[PDB]
Amino acid sequence: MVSLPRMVYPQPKVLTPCRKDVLVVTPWLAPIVWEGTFNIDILNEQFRLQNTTIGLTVFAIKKYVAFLKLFLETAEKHFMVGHRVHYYVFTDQPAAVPRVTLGTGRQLSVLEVRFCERRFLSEVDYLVCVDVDMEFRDHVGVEILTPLFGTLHPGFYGSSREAFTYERRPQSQAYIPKDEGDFYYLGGFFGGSVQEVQRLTRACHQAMMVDQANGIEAVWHDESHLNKYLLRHKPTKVLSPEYLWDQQLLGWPAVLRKLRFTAVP
Template sequence: MDTCRVPEVPRMIYPKAQLLKPTRTDVLVTTPWLAPIIWDGTFDSAILDMQFRNTTIGLTVFAIKKYVVFLKLFLETAEKYFMVGHKVIYYIFTDRPADIPHVPLQEGRQVVVLKVRNYTRWQDVCLHRMEMISNFSEQRFLHEVDYLVCLDVDMKFSDHVGVEILSSLFGTLHPGFFAADRQAFTYERRPLSQAYIPRDEGDFYYIGAFFGGSVLEVHRLTKACHQAMMVDKANHIEAVWHDESHLNKYLLYHKPTKVLSPEYLWDERMLRRPPFVRKLRYVAVPKNHQAIRN
């Protein structure tokens, strides 16, 4: 999809927006650089579905080692809630192709299994995720899809996640930090690291489990993060939150064109849901982190 072109929309009947009656006044809906922050009530799905009607979306997910156990629920709920009515390619990175579950898919959707190596430490999987997305973006994603959505697999969809998220580059607000001051963000604070962010800088804290954009922009992001991590490795340092730390550094200096609210990633076991978070669209599933990662 040529994102520089204004999409044509056929004749449609829908309620007129009221300029003097904003749909949300309880939350910030625009960043200081004029990127929309996506909350329930801030968009019309019917209009957006028509704008993106000829778009193919790629979804990348990593099911390395024991994490393959999460795939069945992930795919089943994605088929119910993710980009319904649109063409989707699920790109599953795994070291266990034989263990990929068979899940019935809607018309125009497919699963592509990409066999990759595993790593001794789960931290190394995080560190090499950006490299793998970058490499495959160049090799095939650029030729097969218009947008990439990069997600963690140990989650499930629980409500609509559609084309309202699509933009040149988007990040998702971390549910644990959306109301925090920048000094409280768990950025990498050691100047030696390429992910270093000073305490007087920072817009938001973005979670590494949900980001994306056009294939070209995702390629630029993942390549830059991988290169930065390789510099850190040569200097014998790992950023405090691995690829998430480098993602936050990148999005600080390459402002996202859309920001997803905490509706798009939530952990009901860890966080109390405030009233302004009207929907929980993508949520963590119960797990024993030590057992899964070991």
């Protein structure tokens, strides 16, 4: 919104597609983020000029606190480097959170569990919610930021919708029939503006309570409700599987030029 400065980079080629092997835009014109689709220098400029702050939230309960060290250290190496970052670690074991050295402009808050959502509105511009038993292995940056985004589940990105493991019982609020659905999104990596993320979590929480009262639990719990939400409220960006992969279970296919955030080991 202030002007970008002069920049020298390769001219985009109107008659040369970015990738010829994958879909790079959804039918509602939301970009699908794959390596090769973005110039990170231009994006870093746009977001820095807005002095963007990104909150990264993780839930580490019981034995999962053991994954915090690697998660945070690799995040320090690959997540939003150069931008303001605020980590929010929700845990039942505050004292077990490892002492990780953070780069300038980056901070960490420990929130005990078992905090007011209005705090997020005043501290960060975007929220990124991921699982803790993971590690960053490559660049995860501002190219993912947008009002609302979901990530393509690694095991279903090439599947037909009828094969998606959506909740199929009409008694559940997460219900999605066989002739509906765009993609199968992961519960472990989603985000967007604080406002949009709060809307999504508020909708999910209410939908899960209705299911509880009706004596039913969606097949894949929160992930099933996330999928129903994103089916009805289209994400403004969709992240490719590069953003959440499991190399042990899925290897390293040619269509993935980078494996950015992966399951541990």
